[PDB]
Amino acid sequence: MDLSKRFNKNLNKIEVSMIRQFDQSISDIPDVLKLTLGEPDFATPKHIKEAAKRAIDADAGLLALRQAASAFVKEKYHLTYNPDNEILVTIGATEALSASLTAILEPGDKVLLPAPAYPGYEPVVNLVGAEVVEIDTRSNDFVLTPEMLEEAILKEGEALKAVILNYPTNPTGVTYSRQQIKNLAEVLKKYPIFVISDEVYAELTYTGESHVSIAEYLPDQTILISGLSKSHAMTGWRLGLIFAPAVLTAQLIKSHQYLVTAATTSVQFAAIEALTNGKDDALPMKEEYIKRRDYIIEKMEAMKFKIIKPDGAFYIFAKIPVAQGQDSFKFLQDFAKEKAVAFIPGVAFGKYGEGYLRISYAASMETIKEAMKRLKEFMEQY
Amino acid sequence: MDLSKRFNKNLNKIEVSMIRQFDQSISDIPDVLKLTLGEPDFATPKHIKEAAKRAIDADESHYTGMAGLLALRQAASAFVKEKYHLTYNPDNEILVTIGATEALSASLTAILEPGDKVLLPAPAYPGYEPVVNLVGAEVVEIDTRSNDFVLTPEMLEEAILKEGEALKAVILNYPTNPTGVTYSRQQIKNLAEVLKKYPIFVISDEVYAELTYTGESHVSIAEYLPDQTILISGLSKSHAMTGWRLGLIFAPAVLTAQLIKSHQYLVTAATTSVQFAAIEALTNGKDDALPMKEEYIKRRDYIIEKMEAMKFKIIKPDGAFYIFAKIPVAQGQDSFKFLQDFAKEKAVAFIPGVAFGKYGEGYLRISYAASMETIKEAMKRLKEFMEQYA
Numbered sequence: 031m032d033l034s035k036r037f038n039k040n041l042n043k044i045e046v047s048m049i050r051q052f053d054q055s056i057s058d059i060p061d062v063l064k065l066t067l068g069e070p071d072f073a074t075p076k077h078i079k080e081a082a083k084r085a086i087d088a089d090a091g092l093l094a095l096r097q098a099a100s101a102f103v104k105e106k107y108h109l110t111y112n113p114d115n116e117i118l119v120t121i122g123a124t125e126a127l128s129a130s131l132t133a134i135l136e137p138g139d140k141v142l143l144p145a146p147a148y149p150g151y152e153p154v155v156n157l158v159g160a161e162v163v164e165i166d167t168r169s170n171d172f173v174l175t176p177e178m179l180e181e182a183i184l185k186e187g188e189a190l191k192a193v194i195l196n197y198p199t200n201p202t203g204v205t206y207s208r209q210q211i212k213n214l215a216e217v218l219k220k221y222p223i224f225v226i227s228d229e230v231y232a233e234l235t236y237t238g239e240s241h242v243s244i245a246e247y248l249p250d251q252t253i254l255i256s257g258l259s260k261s262h263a264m265t266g267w268r269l270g271l272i273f274a275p276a277v278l279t280a281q282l283i284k285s286h287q288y289l290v291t292a293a294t295t296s297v298q299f300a301a302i303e304a305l306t307n308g309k310d311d312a313l314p315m316k317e318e319y320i321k322r323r324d325y326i327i328e329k330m331e332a333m334k335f336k337i338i339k340p341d342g343a344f345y346i347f348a349k350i351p352v353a354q355g356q357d358s359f360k361f362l363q364d365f366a367k368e369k370a371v372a373f374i375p376g377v378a379f380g381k382y383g384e385g386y387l388r389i390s391y392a393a394s395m396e397t398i399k400e401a402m403k404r405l406k407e408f409m410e411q412y
Numbered sequence: 413m414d415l416s417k418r419f420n421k422n423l424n425k426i427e428v429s430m431i432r433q434f435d436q437s438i439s440d441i442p443d444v445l446k447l448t449l450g451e452p453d454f455a456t457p458k459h460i461k462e463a464a465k466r467a468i469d470a471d472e473s474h475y476t477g478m479a480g481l482l483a484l485r486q487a488a489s490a491f492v493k494e495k496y497h498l499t500y501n502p503d504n505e506i507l508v509t510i511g512a513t514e515a516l517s518a519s520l521t522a523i524l525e526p527g528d529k530v531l532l533p534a535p536a537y538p539g540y541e542p543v544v545n546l547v548g549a550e551v552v553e554i555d556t557r558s559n560d561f562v563l564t565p566e567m568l569e570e571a572i573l574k575e576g577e578a579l580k581a582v583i584l585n586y587p588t589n590p591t592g593v594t595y596s597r598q599q600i601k602n603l604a605e606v607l608k609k610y611p612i613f614v615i616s617d618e619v620y621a622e623l624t625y626t627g628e629s630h631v632s633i634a635e636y637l638p639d640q641t642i643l644i645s646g647l648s649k650s651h652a653m654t655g656w657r658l659g660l661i662f663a664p665a666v667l668t669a670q671l672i673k674s675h676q677y678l679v680t681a682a683t684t685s686v687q688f689a690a691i692e693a694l695t696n697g698k699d700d701a702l703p704m705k706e707e708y709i710k711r712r713d714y715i716i717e718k719m720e721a722m723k724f725k726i727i728k729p730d731g732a733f734y735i736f737a738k739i740p741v742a743q744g745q746d747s748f749k750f751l752q753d754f755a756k757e758k759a760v761a762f763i764p765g766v767a768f769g770k771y772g773e774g775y776l777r778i779s780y781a782a783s784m785e786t787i788k789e790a791m792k793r794l795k796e797f798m799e800q801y802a
Binding site: 031032033034036037038039041044047069071072073074079082083086087089121122123124125128132133134135136150153154157158191222223224250251265266267268277278281284285286287288292293294296297 | 413414415416418419420421423426455456461464465468469471473475510513514517518521522523524525542543546547580611612613639640654655656657666667669670673674676677678679680681683684685686
């Protein structure tokens with residue numbers, strides 16, 4: 031306990047993860063059905079497994095990856111990033127946040143974030159010495175308005191360094207239309223701030239019009255974080271991608287510890303394959319997912335849960351009716367105890383998620399039907 | 413639209429690697445024989461590749477914890493007990509990481525603060541400083557030239573006292589990149605006797621441990637300082653698991669709790685197929701390093717022979733796989749340019765001594781992680797190129 035008080039002070043801002051806590055609290059319950067995952071459990075295709083094994087027994091320098099990534103976001107999202115100087119690679123999603131947030135942040139700084147939100151941004155922000163200010167989006171059913179945004183920016187004043195936008199959104203499944211994105215950009219272009227655009231769920235958009243990135247309309251302020259593992263099998267190498275104008279990336283690149291500058295074919299190949307040969311594997315997956323989502327929505331509506339229209343995968347965010355209930359953590363622990371199925375408590379996504387549970391439909395239809403069956407059983411009690 | 417002045421300020425202190433600059437400078441020369449590799453040239457042993465492939469075929473998603481599969485931690489615990497006589501509880505004292513460098517970096521950022529100083533013995537391996545700078549702390553390099561780049565207890569202490577209470581940590585790297593230097597049990601003990609009276613972290617970078625050539629095996633300072641050492645290892649040097657990302661952190665439970673609190677949210681868990689490979693390596697490949705070590709000793713001896721025939725002063729290489737050698741001609745005082753010229757005239761690349769801290773000038777680093785064919789060829793061309801001098 032001598033050196034243990036000589037670490038970085040910001041670790042004293044780091045609380046225990048709400049999700050990890052919830053899982054360890056229900057770990058000793060045998061055969062829990064899990065609808066809690068943020069990464070789907072893909073059945074890796076035979077050809078990909080064989081490719082991976084060949085790359086093991088191989089024993090180029092990120093160029094082909096960067097190029098494929100560039101072509102990909104041009105075709106998909108009409109964005110132009112030069113593979114030579116505007117595209118960075120990370121070994122995993124969380125390193126992308128580490129790299130970019132450590133590059134931009136300074137101790138006084140505030141970071142705005144629509145809430146409820148993925149629990150992983152605030153820790154990183156805290157570690158580098160800054161603060162997250164949530165934006166309560168409850169009044170528009172979790173859809174951030176340009177007005178909400180501008181009022182929050184104005185509230186935070188001169189210490190505002192960045193806004194983090196996550197769309198399609200975890201945990202709510204919120205997506206934004208072209209005009210919405212355009213209006214948000216119209217707010218953001220008036221302030222000297224970075225925009226962290228976390229678009230990892232982009233491929234899973236159910237709207238009919240496809241995903242629109244804020245970088246289409248706000249290219250100079252946007253650091254675009256993307257990836258592939260939400261919709262492609264990666265054999266565990268869930269590489270992240272950072273896209274940003276040359277002038278910004280020339281700075282971002284100096285967060286060296288958090289960036290990939292060389293990798294074996296074993297490491298890159300699943301990402302390269304997903305960007306090129308698997309570039310359209312999300313379409314059928316979307317068909318199936320729309321089915322799963324519709325089924326859950328119908329069955330939970332029948333139980334009189336209030337459901338946020340999930341236009342982007344793969345979460346349903348449900349308002350637990352009964353007063354049980356204002357303690358979603360407990361409500362879900364009791365569901366876990368009596369019915370042996372797990373969701374994640376809305377509280378795990380901060381204050382503004384209480385009274386909600388998050389169901390992750392990146393799971394088989396059978397696990398889904400069983401889960402709803404049991405929930406229906408669990409609710410007769412109420 | 414101008415956000416140039418809106419970044420973290422510490423980014424100011426971070427330039428490109430002098431190594432990278434030298435490689436860039438010679439990128440137009442074709443068919444260059446490179447002896448610059450920072451990783452073993454050997455393929456990963458079959459039994460390990462095999463375990464990887466079985467894991468790929470099993471296709472278990474199998475999210476493991478922040479600390480890695482328990483079987484992996486148990487294997488690492490057992491490994492360092494048997495090999496280095498160290499006792500770490502796999503339940504709470506071992507962290508599994510996507511590579512030794514990320515284990516090290518993550519450890520630095522968890523312990524550092526803007527005020528802080530970190531001490532590092534000459535000649536500095538350039539990978540450390542950027543991490544520290546990114547946090548806003550600073551690296552202070554200890555001039556060890558007067559002992560041929562072997563750190564002495566006196567240098568250490570003098571350095572420690574010179575820095576204030578601003579001193580947060582010492583980084584020891586043994587066997588050392590770029591010198592090949594090692595420390596005996598007694599030397600390690602003497603350094604520990606110095607280090608134990610200061611409230612500071614000891615970052616002990618022991619990735620090269622298995623590549624020790626002295627007939628006494630590697631001794632870790634963690635053996636003498638169990639409570640203040642954070643031990644960084646991995647399987648890249650010992651098991652030729654290169655571009656596999658398996659790093660290991662060993663630390664007292666109290667330190668480990670903090671470390672993992674910080675790592676949870678900054679880095680990604682190791683790939684589980686890799687973690688299975690690592691279990692195979694650590695449990696069934698305990699002596700995988702030996703054949704490689706034999707090959708390395710032969711290459712090393714050939715190089716020492718040839719290089720001493722041309723009057724290079726060679727720092728004693730006891731740990732792999734670098735030879736740091738002093739240039740015996742005037743032009744050698746610009747090692748950068750001397751090696752540029754060597755490259756233009758003979759198409760072979762070494763790394764200039766200047767790329768390793770500020771006390772490295774007049775030296776060159778050969779990496780003998782390289783085939784004997786091209787090592788022999790490199791030495792013959794080097795002879796030819798040295799003819800030109802008197």
